[PDB]
Amino acid sequence: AELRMEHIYKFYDQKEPAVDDFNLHIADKEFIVFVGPSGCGASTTLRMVAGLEEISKGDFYIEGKRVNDVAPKDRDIAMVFQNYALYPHMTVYDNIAFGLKLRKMPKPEIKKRVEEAAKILGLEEYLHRKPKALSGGQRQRVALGRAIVRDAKVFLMDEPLSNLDAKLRVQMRAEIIKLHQRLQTTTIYVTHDQTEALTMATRIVVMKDGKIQQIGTPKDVYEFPENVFVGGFIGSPAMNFFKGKLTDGLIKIGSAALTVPEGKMKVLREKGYIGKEVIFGIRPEDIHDELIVVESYKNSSIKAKINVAELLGSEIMIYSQIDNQDFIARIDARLDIQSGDELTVAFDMNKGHFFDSETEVRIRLE
C-alpha cells in the first residue's frame, strides 16, 4: 500500500508538539525505518499510524483513504509484535491459524494460507509440533505467521529487537529482512539503532525532537547528510567535524591548511563564505593512508600523531587530531603502523562537506 502523512502533528499537555509537521509519502513495498535518539517522536508517530494515539493535526492516508478517525482494527494494519506470546498447548499450525479460526474462515482456506506462511518462515516441517519442541530461534518465528495470514496492507514494528538477547536478536533481524524480501509488505520499523536503519531500510526518516531531519535512501543519507546532527548520528565511527576559517581556495583548520576543490570553492565564494568560520565534515574512510592510496591528493595531507591504532579485521582505526580537534581515520591494515608513531594522511576533499557555523545545515555545493 501507499501511505501519505500530510503535515501531521501530535501535541500532549505542553504547547510544544511531540511530533512536528511530519510529512512523508511511502510507496508500495517500501521498508521504511524511522530512526533517532530518545524522544525523537518515531514511536509516537508509529502509534498515530496504528490508531493507538490520535492525530492532533493533519491527514493520514492509506491507499488514499483518510483513516485518522478509523479504529485500529479497521485500518488493515498488522502490529506484528503485539500479542506475540504463543499458546504453549497449541501446535505451530494452530498458533498461526488462531485468528483465522476466531474469524470463522473455512478450514481449507485456513490450511492454504497457513502452509504458505510456514514456507515463508521456514517452518513447513514443524507445522504439527508444539512450541516447546522448537529451538528459541525457530520458536520466535511462529507468531510472525499470524501477521502474514492476515494479508495486511502494512506491517508496523516498534523496536522489536530492543529486549532480545544477542543471539535471538541476530536471528530476528534476519527474519525481518527475509520477510520483507519474500512478501514485500509496506512496512514501518522504528528503532534507535543507526546500523539497523542503514542495513534494513529502503528509505530512512531521521528524526530528532519530533522533527524530521532528513528523508532518503541509506546511501543518500550517509553520503549527503542534511546537517551536522545527521552526519554525526548516521555511520559508526561517524563523520569527523572540524571548525576552520575558509579563505579563497583553502580551509585552515588549526595550523593545517587544506586545498578546497575549485568546483566547491566556486559555490562557497558565491554564497559568501570566504573569510568566515565554517564547519568541515569528513568521513573516516575518506581520510587516507597517504603512502598506500593510488590517488594523488593535491595539498590536503597532514602529519598526524597516532594516539591509538586499532586493528579491526582488514582495517585499522587511527585515533588522532589536528591540533586540538580529534579525528578518526579508517585505513586498510598495514604492519609498520603503531600507536605512538606519526602518519601522513590525505583528506579526500572531494568527499568533504561544509556546514554553516550558525545553522549547522550543510551548504549545498551538490
Residue numbers in the entry: 2 to 367
What did the article's authors report about this structure?
K43 is involved in ATP coordination and catalysis, interacting with the β- and γ-phosphate groups. Its replacement by an alanine resulted in 80% decreased ATPase activity, impairing the normal function of MsmX to energize the AraNPQ transporter in B. subtilis. The crystal structure was solved at 1.67 Å resolution and the final electron density map allowed to model a detailed refined structure, which comprises all residues of MsmX K43A, except the N-terminus methionine. Interestingly, most crystal structures of NBDs from ABC transporters show a dimer in the asymmetric unit, promoted either by the C-terminal domains or the presence of ATP (or analogs). This is not the case for B. subtilis MsmX, that crystallized as a monomer with one molecule in the asymmetric unit, and very few contacts with symmetry related molecules, as indicated by analyzing the protein interface using PISA server. MsmX N-terminal domain presents the general α/β-type ATPase domain fold, which comprises the RecA-like domain (residues 2–87 and 155–235, in blue) and the α-helical domain (residues 88–154, in yellow). The regulatory C-terminal domain (residues 236–365, in red) forms a mixed barrel with 3 α-helices and 11 β-strands. In the ligand-free MsmX K43A structure here reported, the A-loop length is similar to the one in ATP-bound MalK, already in a conformation that favours nucleotide binding. The MalK F81-Y87 region accommodates the MalF/G helix, providing an hydrophobic environment; in MsmX, the corresponding phenylalanine (F82) is flipped, causing the side chains of Q83 and N84 to point towards the complex interface, which decreases the hydrophobic character of the cleft. Furthermore, in the hydrophobic pocket involved at the interface with the MalF/G, MalK A73 is at 3 Å from the MalF helix, while in MsmX this residue is replaced by K74, which affects considerably the electrostatic potential, the volume and the hydrophobicity of the corresponding pocket.
